[PDB]
């Protein structure tokens, strides 16, 4: 394994700035001019790497088959696209290809019973339908050059899987050789008991706001007993009334804007979440591949900080001394 | 502990279906399968298998006077009774599926919101069960993923026994006769016993290695299999072959089953699966893919197997 380094063969680690490009991964979306505009215009943030983030499904979380690379889904082709439109801008790349649940459902939901029963589905059909899944992308990954792959995204009840784990981490280390994260979701970063697995650490920091100065002790302390490098792989708020009390809640307040209560979260997050050595920054949600008009950024609800004041937060921490030197 | 011969009744719950005239007319038939218990089953809500709060005794499922009268008429019957109140999913998902994250977030609704929500439910029932002088409790059916959270089902038990004094049971589901670690909380271990044909021997071998590690009683609190055409391959499977009738199927099942499970000392007998309130017309019965055996080949092997002197020994 290795520590607060991965090891050379896979790349200090780099100090992550980045946005969310493409979710939720629409074939159709991304093969329009409209993607390259948007694209282009996140570059703006004074970014330096992108996750090209899209999804792959099941019926409910309850079955094992995952479907991917299928209309409406994006393309291998939309996906190289992605990857080579992302770095002939500088960009590094972050790919996250993401199990989502046709019903609905979260995907922290997918579960299976502990014991293989007949008359059910196994965890072993699942992980061998989730490795299909992961690895196709690996391979992806691997031959279009993305200096990192997220193997997965808050699946919160299939982390206690810890052998099934290890064992798909293993399989996409025979096809993959950059670096590994997995995604756990808020509040669980002490949770994951395969960290030592990956590369580097990484969770959905939707953290509230007049929370971060807590969170950073807690999550300082659970980074240290690791001795891994961690990031956050998804950090952000909708610019709506009161999101900030629940910036991972996408549901809250729709169509009430508050262009204010988006820029306060994001000016809280990086006060205390900037330059410290243990941690290696923020891949933000998130950026559509058709975006809006600036002309409309005023009353758009979304996490999308295009045209709205926390984009310059972000612009002004991503170019700053402390956070360039790292 | 009493040799159970019983019969399911009332699923899914609905007020009316129990009002009806119809309803009396099917218990007094379900009679004639020589049973001397019945299980008196019905719904609660809740809207997802991950949401905390459960509604009961609301339109259109049972009211307390329902619930009162079911009995009341089974006890009136000869018959002994299990009240068996069960939580549903409003969405359709499976019971056995219900589950919240093992670590509370602040986030998300936690196991301590759901249980205080169950628990609310079952002593509800554990009271009206008290009341009216029901024989056994069933504290829960198939909730295979709530099983693990050992100290809320101890806690939930404690306050049950607090409020009602007779036989509490657990019904686990098929297969998990061995997975709960808390069967000493209750007084009899139950399982729902839909085992294909050709496994039954094999299962009562299995059963037997798990009731006598334990040394307490058990019996199958569900147990049954549609008269449809493969049913008996899969006896739990309510969608396999809708409308495709198969009333050896049916037959074959109960004839395997009764053929391994029988008056072994460690064995309480089957509350089987199921009778409804409004009950089909005997005409219609060979036309019928329920579980219900009423009018098929089956509630003949059952009514055998009950009146039997080995079985009316139990």
Redesign the interface.
Same mark, same amino acid.
């Not at 979701?185 to 669980?188: I, M």
């Given at each position: 394994s290795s520590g607060l380094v991965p090891r050379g063969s896979h790349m200090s680690m780099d100090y992550i700035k980045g946005m969310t490009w493409g979710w939720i991964g629409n074939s159709e979306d991304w093969r329009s001019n409209e993607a390259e505009r948007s694209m282009e215009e996140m570059t703006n943030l004074a970014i330096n790497w992108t996750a090209i983030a899209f999804q792959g499904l099941q019926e409910? =979380?309850?079955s094992p088959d995952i479907t991917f690379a299928e209309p409406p889904m994006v393309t291998d082709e939309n996906v190289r696209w992605a990857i080579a439109k992302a770095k002939s801008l500088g960009l590094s790349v972050i790919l996250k290809p993401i199990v989502n649940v046709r !019903?609905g459902?979260?995907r =922290?939901?997918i579960?299976f019973? !502990? @014991?293989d $029963?007949?008359?059910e589905p196994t965890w072993s059909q699942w992980f061998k339908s989730y490795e299909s899944f992961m690895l196709h992308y690996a391979k992806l990954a691997e031959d279009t050059g993305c200096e990192m792959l997220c193997i997965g995204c808050a699946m $919160?009840?299939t982390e206690?899987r810890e052998k099934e784990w290890r064992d798909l981490i293993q399989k996409v280390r025979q096809v993959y050789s950059g670096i590994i994260t997995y995604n756990c !979701? @808020?509040?669980?970063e002490d949770?994951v008991t395969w960290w030592d697995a990956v590369d580097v650490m990484s969770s959905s920091g939707?953290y509230p706001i007049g929370s971060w100065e807590h969170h950073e002790s807690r999550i300082k302390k659970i980074v240290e007993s690791w001795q891994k490098p961690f990031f956050f792989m998804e950090a952000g708020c909708p610019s709506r009334l009161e999101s900030g009390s $629940?910036p991972? !809640?996408w549901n809250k307040n729709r169509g009430q804007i508050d262009m204010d209560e988006q820029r306060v979260f994001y000016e809280e997050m990086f006060k205390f979440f900037h330059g410290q050595k243990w941690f290696y920054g923020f891949m933000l949600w998130d950026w559509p591949a058709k975006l809006y008009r600036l002309e409309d950024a005023s009353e758009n609800d979304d996490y999308c900080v295009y045209g709205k004041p926390a984009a310059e937060v972000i612009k002004s921490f991503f170019t700053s001394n402390k956070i360039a030197k790292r």
């Open positions: 409910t =979380a309850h !019903d459902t979260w =922290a939901h579960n019973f !502990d @014991k $029963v007949p008359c $919160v009840q206690r !979701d @808020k509040y669980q949770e939707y $629940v991972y !809640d």
